Design a protein around this ligand. Structure first.
Ligand SMILES: Nc1ncnc2c1ncn2[C@@H]1O[C@H](COP(=O)(O)OP(=O)(O)OP(O)(O)=S)[C@@H](O)[C@H]1O
Ligand SMILES: Nc1ncnc2c1ncn2[C@@H]1O[C@H](COP(=O)(O)OP(=O)(O)O)[C@@H](O)[C@H]1O
Ligand SMILES: Nc1ncnc2c1ncn2[C@@H]1O[C@H](COP(=O)(O)OP(=O)(O)O)[C@@H](O)[C@H]1O
Lengths: 577, 577, 91, 95
């Protein structure tokens, strides 16, 4: 016979107990029993995006047939898993696959309607040699074959809904992804099975945490399989930490460590080390951003409102409109924010809006529509956020952008979603959009003297109201205003540049000190109201990197010696003492 | 049993010491024990480059099993390599090989999970013509086999990531290339094994030299395999030098001899030092370009200052300004610098920047937005850099463009990067940027005498300071002065062309010489104050070759005559003596 | 034709065989660089296509061979011209 | 037939990746096909036509020389083509 060859018995395996005792799913199984008890077209196909457990539905049906919870037309059935891969094995000759398939069909006709077939990956049945649909297809029509498909919706619309007769043979039992409490019940049955597997124990707050956070963070896989993967690798981690040298109980700290190994996101709560960071988040950000207190207050309040569960699950973490003097640390607050937010000065997406001066540049930023040249790789913003969900976007110099781009940002800052050219949505609810401009720079550099921050923000917000449309400036979470710098802040910037210079040259091997008079000459040589601290940057770079490295590479200076940077009338001389 | 017939044990070999104690890769073995102790996804397939010892990871796993360095789920587990040889041999009949693998899987089902299978070349078992692999998918589906695979990433993404059951019965183990010191420790253990084997000796500075020379040069083979090949074939070379016509230690000079005898062929004197390589870089730059050492040594000084690394590595390497006469050797200097510096002449990007004056022209030097014209061409300025990661960019006629292109160039000299129209990062921090103009063409062509390199440099530096941006000369490391040609350049280039012509005629069988007066006539027929060498090229070609090839195909010239290229009254004739 | 390879592939992976191979780089790149049990039993010996003068000496030995065969005479300028014209023209 | 005459007639119409193919030709004389191997082009006369200097020559070939005409139409083709392509020509003769 061929049923022993090519078909696997499920009801024997559910009778031995070698399957998942899946909990729930009763409405899909009731619809499958509706379809399997018809007269013609007895052919359900289970359509779901992967991971929703369609194999689990058919095996739960097999378990109900064994236990006897089925109507009086399914008692005694044998559910058989046909293998479409195991039939195209030796078919290298002519008419050899047809021998196997018709042997299977004659055996299933000889069984006299007591066998429910189950073709997992039903899209494989289309091409297996015309060829493989076109032998089953009258048996699927006349209802004598009680086939049960199990497919994915993308594969269904690609393979089967192009072939119309095979599409009308089957019946769609549309399977949705289960909820989080349903996933909890699933993981309770599997908690019994896993605690009998590893000889470990599992705690139910870890189960509800794993299911909820796996719905929250991993949007790539689907529930419940990603949750089961979390639970099982947590169990294996505990099982190896038993014999790597002491628990037997899995808690959600282990789930957080496993999920950090998966995706890297700060899933863990306050461990009283990053909480001391977050309570002094302002004092943290003043290690790199000296002064500019109001916006540091606002942005650290935005992150502290995000981490505390007070974050709105529709809007992003925060929109921001940076104004003020041109170029002081817009970029420095942004890069230090990316540093103390997730990693470093590299997990940001900078988009210079001065490039975006026409509408086809807006086509660049969103993406090309179908039937156009750059359709196949999408836009620039939305591809960047699909790469980097947990990031900070820096739209830089938004005043040079054509005002239509603010409509893209209307969508962005309304609901955290933006649809690119290829017809897909991007979630912005894990980003911090920050937009910089200079639409009040002369006014803020002039009338800052003894005018408070509130009325200054009011007046420059009126200016921006004359600039933009009211629709967009309603969407801004908080406009903040940078104030102009002072000379002690210039001294602080010079101290930070001397610290990184001493770090680089101590990694090189030198020990260099400086006089305070040289720092005063740098503060003289590095400021204007119209540019700010980039004159200080180029002044430090010219007056240090050019003469001192020339003195070092002249075979003159020795590593290890104290190199006191003495001053000159116009320059900086170095000594070996 | 077929366990002794079609499986090869590895635990017996490590028990009897018939394997090799592979050092390192602790994290991968730990994650493999994580994956092998689950209930789902229980089959890790090792994924890495060819020649990285994934089978060595399995051997170290089996050594930890035998020695007892495994958790309490692997003590008592055997590791059996499935014999691809006799099995893939026996694939003649439809029932001969199938019976073999059937009996093998019946034996593995009889072992009841107590025995772990090993399979190498997993894609070969998947693609074999249930031909081979879906004979095992009814076992790996039902969970009666806990085997471990090994394949390359391309075969895993094509043959396994495409499939549906096969994608989920397997797990990724992402092995990469080992580090330098890991290779050092592995080669120390193999030094012990080889000095016990070949009865020769191996030097440990020769080991770290072999690792460095292997990682720098051999690109196809990877670590550890190329280093092991160097060490052991050098040991065989020392063994042959015992019976050559003494020595027992494998020294680093022997490693350099093996490296030269392989397909890399370096000079070992080139691999002695980097500063001697800088001095020979200078000397070979004074070979293809004859005379005029000032700008060449200035570029050499700038290159040594960049390779000293005392400046910012967030900027590109080179920033010069070749001025004066156009096309007389700026191209040749760029080709010689790119040749002797990194690899060859193809590290050049010669772009006439007089083209990009319109707005969409500026869009084409970054790339067209998605859905539009020049998108598939690329950005024309970054596309040559992405393919040439260590290039020398030659911007010709940079002053004849739009000022925002100069802003883009300042962004290049600032950040060392530029995002193209296709939406990715293009790094510029390893290239040599050279821009040219003609502000000092006649300033040098009329004042070649009585003015040295420094005063002409200060004069044309004042000229460029009057003409161009202040930020333009801020970012140039040295505004150099490219030299006008002398007559020794003319004589050198003309004699090189005569050398290749005399080589081709000697291959035909003609020995021809030239008088000095004919070289004077060529120098007068080739020289012009704006072009120089290439009118000399076409003048040499015409005035020599065309009457000569008229005469050779006239039956006039016979090989075996002293042929001096004498002169006419004002022309050049070939005579026979 | 088990036939000739996959019985000798156990001789690879059993520590007995001392074989020497030779093939085209085409079938090397297409058939030999793929197999797993065939990698760590072999080693690339890149045979160089010979130079001019080595070809000249080989042709002088075979000049003796062919003058013994055809009962004609072969000139050595014709040999060096044959090797040079073959290298210059035929690809 | 390795000794032949190849007329790539009116080459300016085609797509610029074909000019990448011909850069391979003029660089080496060997060209990889789809099967994989390479074919020697070092005995053929690869001739190309165009008309990219049409109105330029029908305007200015009168009362001008021949050399600066070649220079000016070389500038026109430098607007059209790539500089490596006009670099790797033996000689661009202009009608
Ligand atoms: N109701 C359920 N109860 C218990 N486990 C379930 C349930 N539904 C799904 N699962 C688990 O989900 C995992 C795989 O689910 P499946 O439904 O088999 O995925 P799938 O239907 O095969 O989708 P693809 O495309 O074939 S991967 C297994 O670990 C099942 O145990
Ligand atoms: N608060 C600060 N602390 C330390 N350095 C800063 C601070 N603010 C500005 N800088 C320096 O000022 C410069 C301003 O550059 P940037 O932020 O790009 O200009 P813009 O203000 O136009 O965004 C930066 O290069 C940075 O090094
Ligand atoms: N830790 C190690 N110690 C010694 N030799 C090793 C080690 N890792 C790999 N090798 C060498 O690598 C070769 C095995 O190749 P392998 O790693 O199985 O191929 P792949 O690189 O495709 O996985 C053996 O010759 C072995 O000597």
């Amino acid at each position: 016979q061929a049923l022993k060859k090519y078909t696997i018995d499920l009801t024997e395996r559910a009778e031995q107990g070698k399957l998942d005792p899946v909990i729930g799913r009763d409405e899909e199984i009731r619809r499958t029993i509706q379809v399997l008890q018809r007269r013609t077209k007895n052919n359900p196909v289970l359509i779901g995006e992967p991971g929703v457990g369609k194999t689990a539905i058919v095996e739960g049906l097999a378990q109900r047939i064994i236990n006897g919870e089925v109507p009086e037309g399914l008692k005694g059935r044998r559910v058989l898993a046909l293998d479409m891969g195991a039939l195209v094995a030796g078919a290298k000759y002519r008419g050899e696959f047809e021998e196997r398939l018709k042997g299977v069909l004659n055996d299933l006709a000889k069984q006299e309607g007591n066998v429910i077939l189950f073709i997992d990956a039903l899209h494989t049945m289309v091409g297996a040699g015309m060829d493989a649909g076109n032998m089953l297809k009258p048996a699927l029509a006349r209802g004598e074959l009680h086939c049960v498909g199990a497919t994915t919706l993308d594969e269904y619309r690609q393979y089967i809904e192009k072939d119309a007769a095979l599409e009308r043979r089957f019946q769609k039992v549309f399977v949705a992804e289960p909820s989080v409490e349903d996933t909890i019940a699933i993981l309770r049955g599997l908690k019994e099975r896993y605690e009998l597997h590893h000889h470990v124990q599992i705690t139910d707050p870890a189960i509800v945490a794993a299911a909820t956070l796996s719905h929250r963070y991993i949007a790539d896989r689907q529930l419940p399989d990603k949750a089961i993967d979390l639970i099982d690798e947590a169990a294996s981690s505990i099982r190896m930490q038993i014999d790597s040298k002491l628990r037997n109980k899995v808690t959600d700290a282990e789930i957080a460590e496993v999920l950090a190994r998966w995706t890297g996101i700060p899933v863990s709560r306050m461990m009283e080390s990053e909480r001391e960071k977050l309570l002094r988040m302002e004092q943290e950000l003043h290690h790199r951003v000296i002064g500019q207190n109001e916006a540091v207050d606002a942005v650290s309040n935005a992150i502290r409102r995000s981490r505390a569960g007070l974050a709105d699950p529709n809007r992003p973490i925060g929109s921001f409109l940076f104004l003020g003097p041109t170029g002081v640390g817009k970029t420095e607050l942004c890069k230090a924010l990316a540093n103390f937010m997730f990693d470093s000065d590299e997990a940001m997406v900078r988009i210079d809006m001065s490039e975006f001066m026409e509408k086809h540049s807006v086509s660049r930023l969103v993406g090309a529509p179908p039937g156009y040249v750059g359709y196949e790789e999408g836009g620039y913003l939305t591809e960047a956020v699909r790469r980097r969900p947990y990031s900070v976007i820096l739209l830089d110099a938004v005043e040079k952008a054509h005002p239509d781009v603010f409509n893209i940002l209307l969508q962005v800052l309304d609901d955290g979603r933006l649809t690119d050219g290829q017809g897909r949505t991007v979630d912005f609810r894990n980003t911090v959009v920050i937009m910089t401009s200079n639409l009040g720079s002369d006014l803020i550099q002039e009338r800052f003297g003894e005018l408070d921050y509130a009325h200054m923000k009011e007046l420059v917000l009126g200016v921006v109201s004359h600039n933009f449309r009211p629709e967009f400036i309603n969407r801004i979470d908080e406009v903040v205003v940078f104030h102009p710098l002072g000379e002690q802040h210039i001294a602080s910037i010079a101290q930070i540049q001397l610290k990184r210079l001493y770090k680089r040259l101590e990694e090189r091997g030198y020990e260099i000190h400086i006089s305070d008079e040289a720092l005063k000459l740098l503060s003289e040589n590095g400021y204007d109201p119209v540019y700010g601290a980039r004159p200080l940057k180029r002044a430090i770079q010219q007056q240090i990197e050019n003469p001192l490295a020339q003195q070092i590479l002249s075979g003159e200076l020795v590593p290890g010696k104290v190199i006191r940077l003495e001053v000159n009338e116009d320059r900086i001389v170095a000594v070996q003492h």
